[PDB]
């Protein structure tokens, strides 16, 4: 997170940390969709170019955290993975399209004041809340600048959704539909941005219709942290809804 600001305790009870067993370290953020299902960015387990092909028995999920280094005891929980489900048509070769992925926890965690699931949008909610101008909220432990360096506790920055045209024109990559870009325009005066260490991070928006928080995108890829004229790209969750409910209403 860049130019964000330390989060309040229990502000993101759905934040999930993708910790790597060995060597123990951060990897990606993630949200808790269900009581036995985690959702994170696909290129966090599979990305050939970097010989990154983690398997289930290679990582650990950690819910209920706020501090990035200490094993917040009594509060956080560490559940092992039981199976990694990646979208069969995740294009890691061209532009990280359909960069979504699910994870099944062996044993269902117990909710608390610091651990609560997030809602996935439907056709409606997403049909109204997904509009340029509206602001979403990104949260992560990633770097504090492209080049302190890292925060001490989960960072949080609210950002404005940018038009489709502005995204494309701000890059050389072919922008599909399973992705939208959020961020501030070089003149908007205000800054902020995701950054290396926020992958899979949950991008949510509080519904002004039922005070319920909805996750719209998934921190995917970027071109420089908080660089003017550029924006971050997230997975347009709703679209890949069909793949989600399917993977779940099956296994």
């Amino acid at each position: 997170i860049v130019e964000g600001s330390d989060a309040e305790i229990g502000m993101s009870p759905w934040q999930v940390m993708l910790f790597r067993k060995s060597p123990q370290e951060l990897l990606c953020g993630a949200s808790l969709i269900s009581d036995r299902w985690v959702l994170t960015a696909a290129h966090c387990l599979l990305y050939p170019p970097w010989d990154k092909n983690f398997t289930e028995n290679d990582l650990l999920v950690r819910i209920g955290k706020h501090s990035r280094t200490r094993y917040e005891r009594n509060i956080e929980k560490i559940s092992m993975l039981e199976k990694i489900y990646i979208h069969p048509r995740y294009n890691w070769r061209e532009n990280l399209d359909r960069d979504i992925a699910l994870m099944k926890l062996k044993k269902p965690v117990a909710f608390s004041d610091y651990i609560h699931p997030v809602c996935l949008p439907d056709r409606e909610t997403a049909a109204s809340l997904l509009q340029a101008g509206y602001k979403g909220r990104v949260t992560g432990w990633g770097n504090l600048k492209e080049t302190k360096g890292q925060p001490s506790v989960l960072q949080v920055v609210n950002l404005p959704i940018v038009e489709r045209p502005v995204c494309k024109d701000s890059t050389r990559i072919r922008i599909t539909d399973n992705m939208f870009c959020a961020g501030y325009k070089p003149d908007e005066g205000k800054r902020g941005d995701a950054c290396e260490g926020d992958s899979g991070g949950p991008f949510v928006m509080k519904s002004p219709f039922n005070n319920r928080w909805y996750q719209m995108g998934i921190v995917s890829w970027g071109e420089g942290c908080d660089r003017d004229g550029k924006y971050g790209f997230y997975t347009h969750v709703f679209r890949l809804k069909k793949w989600i409910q399917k993977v779940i209403d099956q296994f």
Partner: peptide, 27 residues
């Protein structure tokens, strides 16, 4: 069925230091 709602906020009718910003943007 009970997702979204936060234990220490929406369940105690408490707003976070910077959530109104979001809501205020939905013009």
């Amino acid at each position: 069925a009970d997702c979204g709602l936060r234990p220490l906020f929406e369940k105690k009718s408490l707003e976070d230091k910077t959530e109104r910003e979001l809501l205020e943007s939905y013009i």
